[PDB]
């Protein structure tokens, strides 16, 4: 499992500098080596989110959750996957869906950042 984590980290470093092609290629190698790890998939979802491809981001998040449900110990990462789907809807101003997925996320694992994002989306929707 060692090499996969090395590949993931080189991908993370690239992602942060906005070098998305490099990030995807290293995450691909990490997935090839450790296919039951949903983190490499959610990381690829982050890359598409930042490229503005919200649909692909959500497709990957759904995929990650599928993989994660197999290993019944990833509740925190599943919460993260749901939150990312929520964020992608938020970016597109599709607030009802953003709120709905933040709730799915919170039910798995409550986090202050997701709660804050949800409250923000709730305030925007309520006013509308």
């Amino acid at each position: 499992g060692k090499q996969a984590l090395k590949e993931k980290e080189l991908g993370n470093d690239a992602y942060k500098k906005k070098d998305f092609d490099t990030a995807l290629k290293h995450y691909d190698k990490a997935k090839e080596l450790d296919p039951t790890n949903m983190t490499y998939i959610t990381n690829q979802a982050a890359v598409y989110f930042e490229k503005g491809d919200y649909n692909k981001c959500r497709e990957l998040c759904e995929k990650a959750i599928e993989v994660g449900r197999e290993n019944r110990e990833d509740y925190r990462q599943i919460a993260k996957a749901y939150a990312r789907i929520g964020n992608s809807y938020f970016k597109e101003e599709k607030y009802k869906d953003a709120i709905h997925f933040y709730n799915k996320s919170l039910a798995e694992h409550r986090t202050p950042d997701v709660l804050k994002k949800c409250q923000q989306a709730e305030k925007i929707l309520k006013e509308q």
């Binding site: 991908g11 942060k16 990381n43 979802a45 989110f49 990312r84 964020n87």
Partner: peptide, 5 residues
């Protein structure tokens, strides 16, 4: 940016 793990 979105957070990576």
């Amino acid at each position: 940016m979105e957070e990576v793990d």
